[PDB]
């Protein structure tokens, strides 16, 4: 009864939420996770992702100077009224490093425009890239219209999609992601703090990601935290206050770590099984996986994890290509399969 208990999910004071394991992708808890909502400043997570991809590709460096044009002039564009701003002015020459902290830490809407023009030539072209990555990441309930999320009546996202964008930031552009844990930066002699109050919560190891709030959106937060090498991501959208979005996210993250653990039973290239092969330059095939296996299981139950496999075909016949799928690995707890992964040929076996 205790060994097999399924924990109850805490009550969460928000319109929608999700909690996922970064490594395994397992959804630990969810409510209304696919409902389309106003992302508010969470849009800037995708702005950051695009910029991160550009820097990873070597298109520009953090020390490069960006010239501010009239479109990023904070007090020359009333669309920016009442929003977070660096107070950029035309003709300033600001390092990429400062602008990306403006976007990431301050949600500076002017900074978003300046970087969009720098990275992609125009705001429209940059939004094109944002939406291209929406497609590349397989997000079903997300669409962007502007680089900052202002003036975007037809933009939307969801708790799931914002958690998945978080996952992508951490996984794909780690140098960009590393900025989100910074508690402050200085621009024009003015120190600017991070709005993610969970960075100061000494009871968790939170290192990201993004907050947002409007009247339509309510209070939004995408958070990520670690306990050792285990990492969870929470997205809470339509929270009720500044303090509530933090508190509700903390509830989810803490619950996740208490009841679940991530395990890595198999890495790419490690032989899991072997089987005879016919017609080959070797007599047996080495079989395993083509992507590292991470599972999320009930905490404490690693000892009870069992694995076995099935083969698609009666016989293996050479030629066998590297990563050729030949079966399925079943991971089991309490005599029930909880996870399956493709079983693949680890080394090509040509005909003899």
Coordinates of N, CA and C in Angstrom, one line a residue, residues 6-213:
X6 N 0.1 6.3 -4.9 CA 0.1 7.4 -5.8 C -0.2 8.7 -5.0
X7 N 0.8 9.6 -5.0 CA 0.5 10.8 -4.2 C -0.6 11.7 -4.7
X8 N -1.3 12.3 -3.8 CA -2.3 13.3 -4.2 C -1.6 14.6 -4.6
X9 N -2.1 15.3 -5.6 CA -1.6 16.5 -6.1 C -2.1 17.7 -5.2
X10 N -1.2 18.6 -4.8 CA -1.7 19.7 -4.0 C -2.7 20.6 -4.8
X11 N -3.6 21.3 -4.1 CA -4.4 22.3 -4.7 C -3.6 23.5 -5.1
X12 N -3.8 24.0 -6.4 CA -3.0 25.1 -6.9 C -3.9 26.2 -7.3
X13 N -3.6 27.4 -6.8 CA -4.5 28.6 -7.0 C -4.0 29.3 -8.3
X14 N -4.4 28.7 -9.4 CA -4.1 29.3 -10.7 C -4.9 28.6 -11.8
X15 N -5.1 29.4 -12.9 CA -6.0 28.9 -14.0 C -5.4 27.6 -14.6
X16 N -4.1 27.6 -14.9 CA -3.5 26.4 -15.4 C -2.1 26.2 -14.9
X17 N -1.6 24.9 -14.9 CA -0.3 24.6 -14.5 C 0.2 23.3 -15.1
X18 N 1.5 23.1 -15.0 CA 2.1 21.9 -15.3 C 3.4 21.8 -14.6
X19 N 3.8 20.5 -14.3 CA 5.1 20.2 -13.7 C 5.7 19.1 -14.5
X20 N 6.8 19.3 -15.0 CA 7.5 18.2 -15.8 C 9.0 18.0 -15.3
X21 N 9.5 16.8 -15.6 CA 10.9 16.5 -15.3 C 11.6 16.9 -16.6
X22 N 12.6 17.7 -16.4 CA 13.4 18.2 -17.5 C 14.1 17.1 -18.4
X23 N 14.6 16.1 -17.7 CA 15.3 15.0 -18.4 C 14.5 14.0 -19.1
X24 N 13.5 13.5 -18.4 CA 12.6 12.5 -18.9 C 11.4 13.0 -19.7
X25 N 11.0 14.2 -19.5 CA 9.9 14.8 -20.1 C 8.6 14.4 -19.4
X26 N 8.6 13.6 -18.3 CA 7.4 13.1 -17.7 C 6.6 14.2 -17.1
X27 N 5.3 14.2 -17.4 CA 4.4 15.2 -16.7 C 4.0 14.6 -15.4
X28 N 4.4 15.3 -14.3 CA 4.1 14.8 -13.0 C 2.7 15.3 -12.4
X29 N 2.3 16.5 -12.9 CA 1.0 17.0 -12.5 C 0.6 18.1 -13.6
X30 N -0.7 18.2 -13.8 CA -1.2 19.2 -14.7 C -2.7 19.5 -14.5
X31 N -3.0 20.8 -14.8 CA -4.4 21.2 -14.9 C -4.5 22.3 -16.0
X32 N -5.4 22.0 -16.9 CA -5.7 23.0 -18.1 C -4.4 23.4 -18.8
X33 N -3.5 22.4 -19.0 CA -2.2 22.6 -19.4 C -2.1 23.0 -20.9
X34 N -3.1 22.7 -21.7 CA -3.2 23.0 -23.1 C -4.1 24.2 -23.5
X35 N -4.7 24.8 -22.4 CA -5.6 25.9 -22.6 C -4.8 27.1 -23.1
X36 N -5.2 27.7 -24.2 CA -4.6 28.9 -24.8 C -4.8 30.1 -23.9
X37 N -3.8 30.8 -23.5 CA -3.8 32.0 -22.6 C -2.8 33.1 -23.0
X38 N -3.0 34.3 -22.5 CA -2.1 35.4 -22.7 C -0.8 35.0 -21.9
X39 N 0.3 35.0 -22.7 CA 1.6 34.7 -22.0 C 2.2 35.8 -21.3
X40 N 1.8 37.1 -21.5 CA 2.4 38.2 -21.0 C 4.0 38.2 -21.3
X41 N 4.8 38.5 -20.3 CA 6.3 38.6 -20.6 C 6.9 37.2 -20.8
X42 N 6.2 36.1 -20.6 CA 6.7 34.8 -20.9 C 7.1 34.7 -22.4
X43 N 6.4 35.5 -23.3 CA 6.8 35.6 -24.7 C 8.3 35.9 -24.8
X44 N 8.9 36.6 -23.9 CA 10.3 36.9 -24.0 C 11.2 35.7 -23.7
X45 N 10.7 34.6 -23.2 CA 11.4 33.4 -23.2 C 11.8 32.9 -24.6
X46 N 10.9 33.1 -25.6 CA 11.2 32.7 -26.9 C 12.1 33.7 -27.6
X47 N 11.9 35.0 -27.3 CA 12.9 36.0 -27.7 C 14.3 35.6 -27.3
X48 N 14.5 35.3 -26.1 CA 15.7 34.8 -25.5 C 16.2 33.5 -26.2
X49 N 15.3 32.6 -26.5 CA 15.7 31.3 -27.2 C 16.3 31.6 -28.6
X50 N 15.6 32.5 -29.3 CA 16.1 32.8 -30.7 C 17.5 33.5 -30.6
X51 N 17.6 34.5 -29.8 CA 18.9 35.1 -29.5 C 20.0 34.1 -29.1
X52 N 19.6 33.2 -28.2 CA 20.6 32.2 -27.7 C 21.0 31.3 -28.9
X53 N 20.1 30.9 -29.7 CA 20.4 30.1 -30.9 C 21.4 30.9 -31.9
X54 N 21.2 32.2 -32.0 CA 22.0 33.0 -32.9 C 23.4 33.0 -32.3
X55 N 23.6 33.2 -31.0 CA 24.9 33.3 -30.4 C 25.6 32.0 -30.4
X56 N 24.8 30.9 -30.1 CA 25.4 29.5 -30.2 C 25.9 29.2 -31.6
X57 N 25.3 29.8 -32.7 CA 25.7 29.6 -34.1 C 26.8 30.6 -34.4
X58 N 27.3 31.4 -33.5 CA 28.3 32.4 -33.8 C 28.0 33.6 -34.6
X59 N 26.7 33.9 -34.7 CA 26.3 35.1 -35.5 C 26.7 36.4 -34.9
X60 N 26.8 36.4 -33.5 CA 27.4 37.6 -32.8 C 27.7 37.2 -31.4
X61 N 28.5 38.0 -30.7 CA 29.1 37.8 -29.4 C 28.5 38.8 -28.4
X62 N 28.7 38.5 -27.1 CA 28.1 39.3 -26.0 C 28.8 40.7 -25.9
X63 N 30.0 40.8 -26.4 CA 30.7 42.1 -26.4 C 30.4 43.0 -27.6
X64 N 29.7 42.5 -28.6 CA 29.3 43.3 -29.8 C 28.4 44.4 -29.4
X65 N 28.7 45.6 -30.0 CA 27.9 46.8 -29.7 C 26.7 46.9 -30.7
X66 N 25.5 47.1 -30.1 CA 24.3 47.2 -30.8 C 23.8 48.7 -30.8
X67 N 23.6 49.3 -32.0 CA 23.1 50.6 -32.1 C 21.6 50.7 -32.0
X68 N 21.1 51.5 -31.1 CA 19.7 51.6 -30.8 C 19.1 52.6 -31.9
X69 N 18.0 52.1 -32.5 CA 17.3 52.9 -33.5 C 16.0 53.4 -32.9
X70 N 15.3 54.2 -33.7 CA 14.1 54.9 -33.3 C 13.0 53.9 -32.8
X71 N 13.0 52.7 -33.4 CA 12.0 51.7 -33.0 C 12.2 51.2 -31.5
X72 N 13.4 51.3 -31.0 CA 13.7 50.9 -29.6 C 13.9 52.0 -28.6
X73 N 13.6 53.2 -29.1 CA 13.6 54.4 -28.3 C 12.4 54.3 -27.3
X74 N 12.7 54.1 -26.0 CA 11.7 53.8 -25.0 C 10.6 54.9 -24.9
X75 N 11.0 56.2 -24.9 CA 10.1 57.2 -24.7 C 9.6 57.8 -26.1
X76 N 10.0 57.2 -27.2 CA 9.5 57.6 -28.5 C 8.4 56.7 -29.1
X77 N 7.9 55.8 -28.3 CA 7.0 54.8 -28.7 C 6.0 54.5 -27.6
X78 N 4.8 55.2 -27.5 CA 3.9 55.0 -26.5 C 3.3 53.6 -26.3
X79 N 3.5 52.7 -27.3 CA 3.2 51.3 -27.1 C 3.8 50.7 -25.8
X80 N 5.0 51.3 -25.5 CA 5.8 50.9 -24.3 C 5.2 51.5 -23.0
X81 N 4.2 52.3 -23.0 CA 3.6 53.0 -21.8 C 3.2 52.0 -20.7
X82 N 3.8 52.1 -19.5 CA 3.4 51.3 -18.4 C 4.1 49.9 -18.4
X83 N 5.0 49.7 -19.3 CA 5.8 48.5 -19.4 C 7.2 48.6 -18.9
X84 N 7.9 47.5 -18.7 CA 9.3 47.4 -18.2 C 10.2 47.9 -19.4
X85 N 11.1 48.8 -19.1 CA 12.0 49.4 -20.1 C 13.4 49.7 -19.5
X86 N 14.4 49.5 -20.4 CA 15.8 50.0 -20.1 C 16.0 51.5 -20.3
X87 N 15.1 52.2 -21.0 CA 15.2 53.6 -21.4 C 16.3 53.8 -22.4
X88 N 16.3 52.9 -23.4 CA 17.2 53.1 -24.5 C 16.8 54.3 -25.3
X89 N 17.8 55.0 -25.9 CA 17.6 56.1 -26.8 C 18.4 56.0 -28.1
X90 N 17.9 56.5 -29.2 CA 18.6 56.3 -30.5 C 20.0 56.8 -30.4
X91 N 20.9 56.0 -31.1 CA 22.3 56.3 -31.1 C 23.1 55.8 -30.0
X92 N 22.5 55.3 -28.9 CA 23.3 54.6 -27.9 C 23.9 53.4 -28.5
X93 N 25.1 53.0 -28.0 CA 25.8 51.8 -28.5 C 25.9 50.9 -27.2
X94 N 25.1 49.8 -27.2 CA 25.0 49.0 -26.0 C 25.5 47.6 -26.3
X95 N 26.3 47.0 -25.4 CA 26.8 45.7 -25.7 C 25.6 44.7 -25.6
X96 N 25.6 43.7 -26.5 CA 24.7 42.5 -26.4 C 24.5 42.0 -25.0
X97 N 25.6 41.8 -24.3 CA 25.5 41.4 -22.9 C 24.6 42.2 -22.0
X98 N 24.5 43.5 -22.2 CA 23.6 44.3 -21.4 C 22.2 44.2 -21.9
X99 N 22.0 44.2 -23.2 CA 20.7 44.1 -23.8 C 20.0 42.8 -23.4
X100 N 20.7 41.7 -23.5 CA 20.2 40.3 -23.2 C 19.8 40.2 -21.7
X101 N 20.6 40.9 -20.8 CA 20.2 41.0 -19.4 C 18.9 41.9 -19.2
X102 N 18.8 43.0 -20.0 CA 17.6 43.8 -20.1 C 16.4 43.0 -20.4
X103 N 16.5 42.1 -21.4 CA 15.4 41.2 -21.8 C 15.2 40.2 -20.7
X104 N 16.2 39.5 -20.3 CA 16.1 38.3 -19.4 C 15.7 38.6 -18.0
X105 N 16.4 39.6 -17.4 CA 16.2 40.0 -16.0 C 15.1 41.0 -15.8
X106 N 15.0 42.0 -16.7 CA 14.2 43.2 -16.5 C 12.9 43.1 -17.4
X107 N 12.9 42.1 -18.4 CA 11.8 42.1 -19.4 C 11.7 43.5 -20.1
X108 N 12.8 44.1 -20.5 CA 12.9 45.3 -21.1 C 12.3 45.2 -22.5
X109 N 11.2 45.9 -22.8 CA 10.5 45.7 -24.1 C 11.3 46.4 -25.2
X110 N 11.9 47.6 -24.9 CA 12.8 48.3 -25.8 C 14.1 47.4 -26.2
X111 N 14.7 46.7 -25.2 CA 15.8 45.8 -25.4 C 15.4 44.7 -26.4
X112 N 14.2 44.2 -26.3 CA 13.7 43.2 -27.2 C 13.8 43.7 -28.7
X113 N 13.3 44.9 -28.9 CA 13.3 45.5 -30.3 C 14.7 45.6 -30.8
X114 N 15.6 46.2 -29.9 CA 17.0 46.5 -30.3 C 17.6 45.2 -30.7
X115 N 17.5 44.1 -30.0 CA 18.1 42.8 -30.3 C 17.4 42.1 -31.5
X116 N 16.1 42.3 -31.7 CA 15.4 41.8 -32.8 C 16.0 42.3 -34.1
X117 N 16.1 43.6 -34.2 CA 16.7 44.3 -35.4 C 18.2 43.8 -35.6
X118 N 18.9 43.7 -34.5 CA 20.3 43.3 -34.5 C 20.5 41.9 -35.1
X119 N 19.7 41.0 -34.5 CA 19.8 39.6 -34.9 C 19.2 39.2 -36.2
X120 N 18.1 39.8 -36.6 CA 17.3 39.4 -37.7 C 16.9 40.5 -38.7
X121 N 17.3 41.7 -38.5 CA 17.1 42.8 -39.4 C 15.9 43.6 -39.2
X122 N 14.8 42.9 -38.9 CA 13.5 43.6 -38.6 C 12.8 42.8 -37.5
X123 N 11.8 43.4 -36.8 CA 11.0 42.7 -35.9 C 10.1 41.6 -36.6
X124 N 9.6 41.9 -37.7 CA 8.8 40.9 -38.5 C 9.6 39.6 -38.8
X125 N 10.9 39.8 -39.2 CA 11.7 38.7 -39.5 C 12.0 37.9 -38.2
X126 N 12.3 38.6 -37.1 CA 12.5 37.9 -35.8 C 11.3 37.1 -35.4
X127 N 10.1 37.7 -35.4 CA 8.9 37.0 -35.1 C 8.8 35.7 -36.0
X128 N 9.1 35.8 -37.3 CA 9.2 34.7 -38.1 C 10.0 33.6 -37.5
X129 N 11.2 33.9 -37.0 CA 12.1 32.9 -36.3 C 11.4 32.3 -35.1
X130 N 10.8 33.2 -34.3 CA 10.1 32.7 -33.1 C 9.1 31.6 -33.4
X131 N 8.3 31.9 -34.5 CA 7.3 31.0 -34.9 C 7.8 29.7 -35.6
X132 N 9.0 29.9 -36.2 CA 9.7 28.8 -36.8 C 10.1 27.8 -35.7
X133 N 10.6 28.3 -34.6 CA 11.0 27.5 -33.4 C 9.7 26.9 -32.7
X134 N 8.6 27.6 -32.7 CA 7.4 27.0 -32.3 C 7.1 25.7 -33.0
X135 N 7.2 25.8 -34.3 CA 7.0 24.6 -35.2 C 8.1 23.5 -34.9
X136 N 9.3 23.9 -34.8 CA 10.4 23.0 -34.6 C 10.3 22.2 -33.3
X137 N 9.8 22.9 -32.3 CA 9.6 22.3 -31.0 C 8.3 21.5 -30.8
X138 N 7.5 21.6 -31.9 CA 6.2 20.8 -31.9 C 5.2 21.3 -31.0
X139 N 5.2 22.6 -30.7 CA 4.2 23.2 -29.8 C 2.9 23.4 -30.5
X140 N 1.8 22.9 -29.9 CA 0.5 22.9 -30.5 C -0.4 24.1 -30.2
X141 N 0.0 24.8 -29.1 CA -0.9 25.9 -28.6 C -0.1 27.2 -28.3
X142 N 0.8 27.5 -29.3 CA 1.6 28.7 -29.2 C 1.7 29.5 -30.5
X143 N 1.6 30.8 -30.4 CA 1.8 31.7 -31.6 C 2.2 33.1 -31.1
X144 N 3.2 33.6 -31.8 CA 3.7 35.0 -31.5 C 3.4 36.0 -32.6
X145 N 3.3 37.2 -32.2 CA 3.1 38.3 -33.2 C 4.1 39.4 -33.0
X146 N 4.7 39.6 -31.8 CA 5.7 40.7 -31.6 C 6.8 40.1 -30.8
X147 N 7.9 40.8 -30.8 CA 9.2 40.4 -30.1 C 9.2 40.4 -28.6
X148 N 8.2 41.2 -28.1 CA 8.1 41.5 -26.6 C 6.8 41.0 -26.0
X149 N 5.8 40.8 -26.8 CA 4.5 40.4 -26.3 C 3.5 41.5 -26.0
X150 N 4.0 42.8 -26.3 CA 3.1 43.9 -26.3 C 2.4 44.0 -27.7
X151 N 1.2 44.6 -27.7 CA 0.6 44.9 -29.0 C 0.4 43.6 -29.8
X152 N -0.1 42.6 -29.2 CA -0.2 41.3 -29.8 C -1.5 40.6 -29.5
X153 N -2.6 41.1 -30.0 CA -4.0 40.6 -29.7 C -4.1 39.1 -30.1
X154 N -3.4 38.6 -31.0 CA -3.5 37.3 -31.5 C -2.4 36.3 -31.1
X155 N -1.6 36.7 -30.1 CA -0.6 35.8 -29.6 C -1.2 35.0 -28.5
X156 N -0.6 33.8 -28.3 CA -1.1 32.9 -27.2 C 0.0 31.9 -26.9
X157 N -0.1 31.3 -25.7 CA 0.6 30.1 -25.4 C -0.2 29.3 -24.3
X158 N 0.5 28.3 -23.7 CA -0.2 27.4 -22.7 C 0.9 27.1 -21.7
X159 N 0.4 26.5 -20.6 CA 1.3 26.1 -19.5 C 2.3 25.0 -20.1
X160 N 1.8 24.0 -20.8 CA 2.6 23.0 -21.3 C 3.7 23.6 -22.3
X161 N 3.2 24.5 -23.2 CA 4.1 25.0 -24.2 C 5.2 25.8 -23.6
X162 N 4.8 26.6 -22.5 CA 5.9 27.5 -21.9 C 6.8 26.6 -21.0
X163 N 6.4 25.6 -20.4 CA 7.3 24.6 -19.8 C 8.2 24.0 -20.9
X164 N 7.7 23.6 -22.0 CA 8.5 23.1 -23.1 C 9.5 24.1 -23.7
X165 N 9.2 25.3 -23.8 CA 10.1 26.4 -24.2 C 11.2 26.5 -23.1
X166 N 10.9 26.5 -21.8 CA 11.8 26.4 -20.7 C 12.8 25.2 -20.9
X167 N 12.3 24.1 -21.1 CA 13.1 22.9 -21.3 C 14.1 23.1 -22.5
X168 N 13.6 23.7 -23.6 CA 14.4 24.0 -24.7 C 15.5 25.0 -24.4
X169 N 15.2 26.0 -23.7 CA 16.2 27.0 -23.3 C 17.4 26.3 -22.5
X170 N 17.0 25.5 -21.5 CA 18.0 24.8 -20.7 C 18.8 23.9 -21.5
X171 N 18.2 23.1 -22.4 CA 18.8 22.0 -23.1 C 19.7 22.5 -24.3
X172 N 19.1 23.5 -25.1 CA 19.7 23.9 -26.4 C 20.6 25.1 -26.3
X173 N 20.3 26.0 -25.4 CA 21.1 27.2 -25.3 C 21.5 27.5 -23.8
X174 N 22.3 26.6 -23.2 CA 22.7 26.7 -21.8 C 23.4 28.0 -21.4
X175 N 24.2 28.6 -22.4 CA 24.8 29.8 -22.1 C 23.8 31.0 -21.9
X176 N 22.8 30.9 -22.7 CA 21.7 31.9 -22.6 C 20.9 31.6 -21.2
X177 N 20.6 30.3 -21.0 CA 19.9 30.0 -19.8 C 20.6 30.4 -18.5
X178 N 21.9 30.4 -18.5 CA 22.7 30.7 -17.3 C 22.5 32.1 -16.8
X179 N 22.0 33.0 -17.7 CA 21.7 34.4 -17.3 C 20.5 34.5 -16.3
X180 N 19.6 33.6 -16.4 CA 18.3 33.8 -15.6 C 18.4 33.7 -14.1
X181 N 19.5 33.1 -13.6 CA 19.8 33.0 -12.2 C 20.4 34.3 -11.6
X182 N 20.8 35.2 -12.5 CA 21.4 36.5 -12.0 C 20.4 37.3 -11.3
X183 N 20.8 37.8 -10.0 CA 19.8 38.4 -9.2 C 19.7 39.9 -9.6
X184 N 20.7 40.5 -10.2 CA 20.8 41.9 -10.6 C 21.8 42.2 -11.8
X185 N 21.6 43.3 -12.5 CA 22.6 43.8 -13.3 C 22.5 45.4 -13.3
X186 N 23.5 46.0 -13.8 CA 23.5 47.5 -13.7 C 23.4 48.0 -15.1
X187 N 22.5 49.0 -15.4 CA 22.5 49.7 -16.6 C 22.2 51.2 -16.4
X188 N 23.1 52.0 -17.0 CA 23.1 53.5 -16.9 C 23.0 53.9 -15.4
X189 N 24.0 53.3 -14.6 CA 24.1 53.6 -13.2 C 23.0 53.2 -12.3
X190 N 22.1 52.4 -12.8 CA 20.9 52.0 -12.1 C 20.8 50.5 -12.0
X191 N 20.9 50.0 -10.8 CA 20.8 48.5 -10.5 C 19.4 48.0 -10.7
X192 N 19.3 46.9 -11.3 CA 18.0 46.3 -11.7 C 18.0 44.9 -11.1
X193 N 17.0 44.6 -10.4 CA 16.8 43.2 -9.8 C 16.0 42.3 -10.7
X194 N 16.0 41.0 -10.3 CA 15.3 40.0 -11.0 C 13.9 39.8 -10.3
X195 N 12.8 39.7 -11.1 CA 11.5 39.6 -10.6 C 11.1 38.2 -10.1
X196 N 11.9 37.2 -10.4 CA 11.7 35.9 -9.9 C 12.1 35.7 -8.5
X197 N 11.2 36.0 -7.6 CA 11.5 36.0 -6.1 C 12.0 34.7 -5.6
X198 N 11.7 33.6 -6.3 CA 12.2 32.2 -5.9 C 13.7 32.1 -5.9
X199 N 14.4 33.0 -6.6 CA 15.9 33.0 -6.6 C 16.4 33.2 -5.2
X200 N 15.6 33.9 -4.3 CA 16.0 34.2 -2.9 C 15.5 33.2 -1.9
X201 N 14.8 32.2 -2.4 CA 14.2 31.2 -1.5 C 15.3 30.2 -1.2
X202 N 15.9 30.2 -0.1 CA 17.1 29.4 0.3 C 16.7 27.9 0.5
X203 N 15.4 27.6 0.5 CA 15.0 26.2 0.7 C 14.9 25.4 -0.6
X204 N 15.0 26.0 -1.7 CA 15.0 25.4 -3.1 C 16.3 25.9 -3.8
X205 N 16.6 25.2 -4.9 CA 17.7 25.6 -5.8 C 17.1 26.0 -7.1
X206 N 16.4 27.1 -7.1 CA 15.7 27.7 -8.3 C 16.7 28.5 -9.1
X207 N 16.8 28.3 -10.4 CA 17.8 29.0 -11.2 C 17.1 29.7 -12.5
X208 N 15.8 29.7 -12.5 CA 15.1 30.3 -13.6 C 13.6 30.2 -13.3
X209 N 12.7 30.6 -14.3 CA 13.1 31.2 -15.6 C 12.5 32.6 -15.8
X210 N 11.2 32.7 -15.8 CA 10.6 33.9 -16.2 C 9.2 34.2 -15.6
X211 N 9.0 35.4 -15.2 CA 7.7 35.9 -14.7 C 7.0 36.8 -15.8
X212 N 5.7 36.9 -15.5 CA 4.9 37.9 -16.4 C 3.6 38.1 -15.7
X213 N 3.0 39.3 -16.0 CA 1.7 39.7 -15.5 C 1.1 40.7 -16.3

